[PDB]
Design a protein around this nucleic acid. Structure first.
Lengths: 101, 84, 93, 75, 106, 74, 169, 108, 81, 68
RNA sequence: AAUUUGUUACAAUACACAUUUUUUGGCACCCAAAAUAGGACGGGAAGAGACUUUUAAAGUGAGACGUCGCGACCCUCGCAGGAGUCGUUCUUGACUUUUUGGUCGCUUGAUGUUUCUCUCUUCCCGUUC
């Protein structure tokens, strides 16, 4: 059923369902259980972050997240690690997000 | 305010000519218009100034001054400019 | 140079000469007049400045003088999709 | 919301560039609000006009997202 | 998340007690117990500071090799050392072990 | 006039096989039997093979997203 | 009076010179008849505002010096200034024109101050200066100017530029 | 829920807005639009140096950086300092907010 | 918004276009919609690499447009009051 | 005459591969749930481009196609 | 013997929207170059090598779009964004007419894209230890 038919509260119940029961429930269960998540961006740089908050667009607030990025030129590789205490992440850059055991 | 020039070197380019004019007229006063709108060339250029006194001075001093070979014939404009 | 009001939004500033950055690395400098919801804006007398590839190499880290090829285009209407960031150049007449 | 106005273009042989590289020529049949354009007797233009040109199919539809410019070669 | 009165069992010690002797782990607990008050928000800043670290499902504490934990408890003490220190106005050099214990135990 | 998605519905019921070009970055073109479609022009293709740009491997019944669609060609 | 920051602030930077660029500044109450006897001090108050053109015409300035790094500035009008020497390293890459009419610049003093450049300016006017009268002054000015597009309204003649280059060699 | 409403309570804080270009902006933050258009005040915006035998940085971001008019000639590395940059929302990648503020109060 | 209304006010006048592909289409504007997709008449085209051609009619997608140059005398037009 | 959404409703808790548009990487795993946008959740996924991955969330814009 | 309060209308800001036409990304990659204890670095000029052209003698990696410019055996009269009309009263509105450069060389303007392949010596001027 299309979204333009529903009322103002039916959208709130719809978003509550989608967060509680749905794909993004992987992130929600990760926020409550304090389980660290791995996030791959489009950039190709992967952050190991603990999710304080998330949102519909997938943009999310992470604290203590660690960023891992490697670069190569003519098959000469170097691995670089960067630690930031507080992160707000816009959700359009992410591709895959996994929940660590 | 405006001063209608005449009898100048047509062989020189437009923008360059305008620049030259500006350079010339900065000593007398603040030049409001860089070059004449018509841009027919061959002398016809209206040097618009802020002050009338400055314009007058220019007219006095640069009457038959050597600018790109030929002597420039300075004179006061008939009608007032669109900017002024 | 010029100090913009500490809290000033795109609506607060009108007729200021701006400096507009697009995704392609070129800049449109001119007076802003209108703008829109998705932030496509209208510049009055605008000149697009560009960085030469040789100039771009010069910009790489080591007084630098860049030759910036620019062309004049009056009264344009930009597209919000292309715009990247905006800076203030001057204050109105 | 609003339908693009191709109304004078349809049934006329039209060239249109698909993406940065491509140029397809065909007789325009129909169109929609996203500019998705279906045309028949499609041909993919290339540097050598008779040689590298190869027809596509009896009916071809184009996503409006890949459309850049649309020129009609015709009245 | 509990709307009803009930008994629940959990382990405060988790990894550190399992790794390190029992006298010392309570002491590392008490270094922590003082600290989280002094860490209003930097707790989650310092405890998560190594993002490689994860909390075990049964356990409460971040499970780790315990070297940063010695660094964590030391940084946390310095936050306690300054906050106890600033209210009374003491120099950091003037702080001594007998004062540092008096900060810990009082 | 023949609306484009009407034409696609004529690809669904007429069971004609179609070749479909993807975006220029991916470098493969898919071909198969278009079964059904949505409003977003993302289509299910039965008995689809991916050809790099004729040794391509057969795919299956596969849902293909409309964002990457360029051409749908018989 | 002396060229201060306050004066600069006061100056009318509203009416832009529409020939090229923007913000045609005129320092003090009016740069035309400001009477700046000392060198152009407190240049930092402008802070490279904006072919940015500054009109200093009808002022007492002795030396063309004391500038802050100005990237924009392309035009200097310095007419009716008692300029003697104009040696500097600040305004080098910047600037496209220099109008020095009715000043006191020496034929040797003007040549000495520049020290020569591989490329410089593009438009130059030295008219109503003592130096221009001096014998071979045009040849000396062309040799000093090094690269040049104009010399007192008349362009250094292509052939004249070649002969001047030969004299330099 | 729109998490952008969080950023609107971060006003008057030191922040880095790390864009899609790789360009990073340190500055004091002002009102954030509902589209996440972020307007800053006193900002030093730069590009990181991939070392890697001096591999070539972003070619578009260097030009866009020199064309702000804020890059000073004598800067050895690649940076620019300016007042009042206004950033479109879709350009933002990451936002690094200060360590001091507590989330439990602001995330409600 | 005003920016699109100014494009509607430019109908029947020579305008310039920059597509995000890099080309330049200068010619007379016949139609424009609120989706910014315009169609132009008797238009000179400059390819991204500079090769210039001429075509009688053109229709471009608004999403691919980068900037549009409009006759200057529309600056004082009543939209800006 | 199956359409995409009932096709995803029929592929729930079946082994499905999903090819992303970038590196020709495909995640092979048991589908859990999908959103309106066709966001994906997977269990016991494996990344092919060789690894084993416990649980996965895949955003809708990056997927190329979905197969069984 | 202008201020404040109430009501009505219009305009601006914040309460919206991840599915091909603007703001929840077709994303990212060419690769490689300085270390010492008089010395580097940039710019200009000259010579030579190797390149090209003609049948030993001539200049500096080569081949393609434009961009505004240096010459001219040419054209060209010479003073009016504005102009006219009507309404209306001492300069305003509504309705019509429509830009100098029109060109050619460049006996190397001057200068940016895009493909392929592989510098040393001498002088002059600035910066750094």
């Amino acid at each position: 059923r299309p979204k333009h038919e529903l009322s103002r509260a039916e959208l709130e119940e719809l978003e509550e369902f989608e967060f509680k029961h749905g794909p993004m429930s992987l992130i929600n269960d990760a926020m409550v259980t304090r389980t660290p998540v791995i996030i791959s961006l489009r950039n190709n740089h992967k952050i190991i972050a603990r999710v304080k908050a998330f949102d519909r667009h997938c943009n999310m607030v992470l604290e203590n997240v660690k960023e891992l990025w490697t670069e190569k030129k003519g098959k000469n590789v170097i691995n670089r690690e960067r630690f930031i205490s507080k992160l707000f992440l816009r959700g359009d850059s992410v591709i895959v997000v996994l929940k660590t055991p | 305010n405006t001063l209608y020039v005449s009898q100048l070197n047509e062989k020189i380019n437009m923008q360059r000519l305008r620049v030259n004019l500006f350079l010339l007229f900065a000593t007398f006063g603040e030049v409001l218009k860089v070059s004449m709108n018509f841009k027919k060339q061959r002398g016809q250029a209206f040097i618009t100034m802020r002050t009338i006194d400055q314009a007058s001075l220019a007219q006095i001093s640069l009457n038959g001054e050597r600018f790109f070979g030929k002597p420039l014939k300075v004179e006061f404009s008939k009608s007032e400019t669109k900017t002024l | 140079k010029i100090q913009v009001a500490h809290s000033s939004r795109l609506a607060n500033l009108i007729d200021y000469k701006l400096r507009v950055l697009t995704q392609d690395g070129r800049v449109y400098i001119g007076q802003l007049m209108a703008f829109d919801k998705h932030m496509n804006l209208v510049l009055n007398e605008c000149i697009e400045e560009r960085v030469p590839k040789t100039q771009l190499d010069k910009l790489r880290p080591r007084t630098l003088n860049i030759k910036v090829e620019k062309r004049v285009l009056g009264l344009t209407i930009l597209r919000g999709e292309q715009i990247l960031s905006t800076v203030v150049e001057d204050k109105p007449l | 919301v609003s339908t693009p106005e191709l109304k004078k273009y349809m049934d006329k042989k039209i060239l249109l560039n698909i993406n940065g590289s491509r140029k397809v020529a065909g007789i325009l049949r129909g169109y929609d609000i996203f500019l998705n354009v279906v045309l028949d007797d499609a041909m993919e233009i290339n540097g050598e006009d008779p040689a590298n040109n190869h027809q596509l199919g009896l009916q071809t539809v184009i996503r409006g997202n890949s459309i850049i410019s649309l020129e009609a070669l015709d009245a | 998340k509990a709307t009803e009165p009930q008994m629940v069992l959990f382990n405060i010690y988790d990894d550190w007690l399992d790794r390190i002797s029992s006298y010392t782990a309570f002491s590392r607990l008490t270094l922590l117990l003082r600290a989280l008050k002094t860490n209003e928000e930097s707790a989650k800043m310092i405890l998560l500071s190594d993002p490689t670290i994860t909390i075990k499902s049964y356990h409460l504490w971040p499970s780790f090799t315990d070297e940063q934990w010695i660094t964590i408890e030391s940084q946390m003490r310095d936050l306690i050392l300054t906050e106890y220190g600033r209210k009374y106005n003491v120099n950091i050099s003037a702080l001594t072990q007998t004062e540092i214990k008096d900060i810990i135990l009082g | 006039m023949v609306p484009p998605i009407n034409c696609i519905f004529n690809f669904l019921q007429q069971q004609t096989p179609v070749t479909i070009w993807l975006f220029e970055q991916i470098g493969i073109r898919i071909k198969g039997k278009i079964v059904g479609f949505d409003e977003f022009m993302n289509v299910v293709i039965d008995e689809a093979v991916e050809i790099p740009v004729e040794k391509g491997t057969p795919l299956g019944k596969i849902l293909l997203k409309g964002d990457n669609i360029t051409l749908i060609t018989s | 009076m002396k060229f201060t920051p306050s004066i600069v602030i006061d100056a009318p930077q509203y009416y832009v010179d529409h020939f090229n660029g923007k913000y045609n500044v005129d320092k003090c109450v009016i740069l035309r008849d400001l009477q700046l006897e000392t060198d152009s001090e407190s240049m930092p108050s402008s802070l490279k505002h904006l072919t940015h053109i500054l009109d200093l015409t009808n002022n007492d300035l002795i030396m063309i010096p004391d500038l802050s790094r100005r990237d924009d500035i392309h035009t200097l009008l310095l007419g009716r200034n008692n300029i003697v020497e104009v040696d500097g390293r600040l305004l080098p890459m910047n600037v496209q024109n220099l109008t020095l009419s009715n000043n006191s610049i020496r034929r040797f003093e003007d040549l000495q101050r520049l020290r020569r450049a591989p490329r410089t300016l593009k438009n130059l006017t030295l008219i109503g200066n003592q130096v221009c009268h001096l014998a071979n002054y045009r040849e000396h000015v062309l040799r000093l100017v090094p690269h040049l597009e104009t010399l007192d309204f008349q362009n250094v003649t292509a052939e004249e530029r070649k002969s001047a280059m030969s004299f330099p060699r | 829920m729109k998490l952008v409403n969080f950023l609107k309570k971060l006003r008057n804080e030191q922040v880095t807005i790390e864009l899609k270009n790789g360009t990073t902006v340190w500055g004091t933050l002002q009102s954030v639009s509902p589209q996440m258009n972020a307007i800053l005040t006193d900002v030093k915006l730069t590009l990181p140096q991939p070392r890697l035998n001096k591999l070539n940085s972003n070619g578009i971001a260097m030009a866009s950086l020199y064309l702000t008019g804020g890059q000073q000639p004598t800067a050895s590395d690649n940076i620019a300092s300016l007042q009042y940059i206004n950033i479109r929302g879709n350009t933002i990648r990451q936002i690094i907010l200060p360590d001091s503020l507590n989330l439990d109060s602001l995330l409600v | 918004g005003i920016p699109v209304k100014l494009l509607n006010e430019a109908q029947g006048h020579i305008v310039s276009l920059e597509l995000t592909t890099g080309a330049t289409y200068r010619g007379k504007l016949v139609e424009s919609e609120d989706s910014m997709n315009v169609q132009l008449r008797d238009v000179i085209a400059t390819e991204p690499q500079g090769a210039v051609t001429h075509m009688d009619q053109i229709f471009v997608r608004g999403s691919q447009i980068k900037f549009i140059v409009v006759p200057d005398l529309l600056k004082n037009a009543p939209l800006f009051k | 005459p199956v359409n995409p959404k009932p096709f995803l409703k029929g592929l729930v808790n079946h082994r499905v591969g999903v090819k992303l548009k970038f590196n020709s990487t495909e995640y092979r795993g048991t589908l859990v749930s999908t959103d309106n946008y066709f966001n994906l959740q997977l269990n016991e996924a494996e990344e092919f481009v060789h690894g084993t991955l416990g649980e996965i969330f895949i955003r809708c814009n990056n997927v190329l196609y979905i197969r069984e």
